[PDB]
Amino acid sequence: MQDYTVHIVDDEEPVRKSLAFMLTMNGFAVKMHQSAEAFLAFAPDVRNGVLVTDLRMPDMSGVELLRNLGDLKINIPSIVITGHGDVPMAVEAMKAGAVDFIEKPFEDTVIIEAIERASEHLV
Ligand SMILES: [Mn+2]
């Protein structure tokens, strides 16, 4: 079986803990990051990891995070969670290299399938 880690980034702690807890209850190895900046500083050390990030985050957006990762010469399959009915954000996220976007609110089954898909990109 594959042993990958799901890295979660969200500006709202309650939403972050909700997702994290749900994925762990489903058997995924999960790591919650305090902010986009914290994940960016942790990124060089990631091995066999997938990223699930929120898009609208005041300090650093999900898109900007994706562009910074690219600058670090690092490729981490990413799923971007976008605001309800926010088309500009989903489009920009895909143009930025995200494996896929997920519109919230979302069904656990759906985010779980999106994560399994991103893991397809792990070498
Ligand atoms: Mn947000």
SS3 of the chain: the string is: CCCCEEEEECCCHHHHHHHHHHHHHCCCEEEEECCHHHHHHHHHHCCCEEEEEECCCCCCCHHHHHHHHHHCCCCCCEEEEECCCCHHHHHHHHHCCCCEEEECCCCHHHHHHHHHHHHHHCC
For ligand 1, the distance from its centroid to the CA atom of residue 58, given in whole angstroms, is 8
Resolution in A: 2.0
Q: Which token pair is 123?
A: 């070498």
Pairing of strands 100-103, 49-54: unpaired
For ligand 1, the distance from its centroid to the CA atom of residue 117, given in whole angstroms, is 23
Domains of the chain (ranges; CATH) run: 1-123 (3.40.50.2300)
Q: Which token pair is 68?
A: 């910074």
Residue 56 annotated in ligand binding: yes
Instruction: Identify whether the C-beta of residue 2 lies closer than 8 Å to the C-beta of residue 119.
Output: yes
